[PDB]
Ligand binder design. Sequence first.
Ligand SMILES: CCCCCCCCCCCCCCCCC[C@@H](O)O[C@H](CO[C@H](O)CCCCCCCCCCCCCCC)COP(=O)(O)OCC[N+](C)(C)C
Lengths: 48, 184, 48, 40
Amino acid sequence: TAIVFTEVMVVTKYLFQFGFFPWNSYVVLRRYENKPYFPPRILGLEKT
Amino acid sequence: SQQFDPYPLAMQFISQYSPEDIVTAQIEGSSGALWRISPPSRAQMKQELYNGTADITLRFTWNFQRDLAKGGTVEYTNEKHTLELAPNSTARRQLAQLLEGRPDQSVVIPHLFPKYIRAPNGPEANPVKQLQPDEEEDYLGVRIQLRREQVGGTKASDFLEWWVIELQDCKADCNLLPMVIFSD
Amino acid sequence: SQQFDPYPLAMQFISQYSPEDIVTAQIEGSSGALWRISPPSRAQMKQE
Amino acid sequence: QLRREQVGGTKASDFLEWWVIELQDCKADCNLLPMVIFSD
Ligand SMILES: CCCCCCCCCCCCCCCCC[C@@H](O)O[C@H](CO[C@H](O)CCCCCCCCCCCCCCC)COP(=O)(O)OCC[N+](C)(C)C
């Protein structure tokens, strides 16, 4: 379960990373720069 | 923020301040009062502005008064921007021409109006160093002009004078100068 | 005090202060200075 | 109230203006406005 979970996590982060998703617009990201409760940041799917 | 988004230092500075903590001062340009100067002192102004040898200074001073009931000790925050005028330079000669009574002459002083100012809890309202990195080329230019109004006889003292300044590059709010200030 | 004697709140307030602690400011009405306004701004005043 | 004083031509700018205010119900000190202030 550890190996499967880490594999799934890396792939999911990679998929979300793409900029086409609305969360990532360079405006939403900039204003939500250090707010800890941005939904992607809490779920770990935020792109950096 | 969108306007200053590419720049990193500017972006961090603006991010530091809350939106309800920055104010725009819509200082009027043309809505001034009569210029009151004794005729001897005005004549001396014009003569020294023409045939002067020492450089003449020209200062633009801002002064913010903040409410003292909200705590804080210092109640006025002021600072000046000083611009020199070397003898026989184009600007000084232009002003000496301006006082002559021309109907539609105008002068342009480059880099005199710092648009972004900071008002700390101390008596130093320094222009933001960051939003204007050049610190001398990022200052806006100002177009100065003198308006006459006949009354009525001595020639130069015969009629009312006042001064109208406007921003160098103005399209529709030419009668208004904005001034954005960040207060800690 | 005699003028504001019937009123209770006013009477207590005035009683609170010493006689040498209240001052009357005889601000002059007519002794002003010339009204200085640029003719364009006065015309705009009247029109607005 | 507004007071004028001719000097001397443009019409409205032709002469001096100043403003005189007085209390609404004034009998003999019409040229004076009292203002009582209590200082702690
Ligand atoms: C962001 C949120 C993500 C949520 C994801 C939830 C996933 C939680 C559980 C993680 C996966 C479950 C793993 C449980 C495994 C238990 C059984 C396991 O022991 O069987 C293994 C067998 O496991 C299989 O081999 C692989 C299983 C792969 C399961 C993939 C699950 C994918 C789930 C994707 C969920 C995505 C959710 C996305 C939400 C947005 C035995 O391996 P073994 O026999 O010794 O291997 C020999 C190798 N040989 C043959 C080469 C010698």
